[PDB]
Amino acid sequence: MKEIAQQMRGELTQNGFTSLETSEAVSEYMNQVNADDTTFVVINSTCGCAAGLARPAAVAVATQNEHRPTNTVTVFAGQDKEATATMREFIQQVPSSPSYALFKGRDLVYFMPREFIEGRDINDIAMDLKDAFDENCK
Template identity: 45%
Template sequence: MYPEEMVKPMREELSVVGFQELYTAEDVEQALAKEGTTLVVVNSVCGCAARNARPGARMSLDNAKTPTQLVTVFAGVDKDAVSKAREHMFPFPPSSPSMALFKNGELVHMLERHHIEGRPAEMIAENLKDAYNEFC
């Protein structure tokens, strides 16, 4: 587990643009039970989260259509919340960072680490925008 003071600035990169931080399995269940679309970002301390995932998630919000709610869990910190989010991402294997778009609680779009790592944030943002335009 990473110390909270270390991950605080990494959390804030998403929370300052409207992502709600989920800390427990119950938080995840409540978020995914809501009607509409929900983007779940599994945040991470790794370099591809810093370079690609978080900036891509932020850039994706510059779109006419966006998810109803934005939430995030932090791998290596929010163990129960991450486990519960990953249950909902089945059949995709656990990876972090990752991003999942849900519509009315059903998984409709998934970006795994291998879709994020080594790709520019702009490409990740475009991928998410395409999903928003289709499902939001």
């Protein structure tokens, strides 16, 4: 589980995502974003099939789309509990994992819960992310 979680985290950090692993790191990051920037958050997970769908879609769209988020960050639900709880204070939605959140400044503009990922074709998940970035990112 140790090496597995680091690989699942590495899938994101090897492709531009900043890993926020303490409550303090989340507060320091989210309370310092510029009001006009967009921040894409992947809430990672180790278990089930949904987690394996969420990582590739997020990496592919957030790094290749024309309209891309200013910032890409991740918290790891289950593994980094305090970081995940603090991020969820900014999101203010029903908690689930994996899940996606998109911010403009500190305001949530898009949220995808676990139930919209589970059992969904990876190409369709990527398409929703493309739509959300196109509507909200410069």
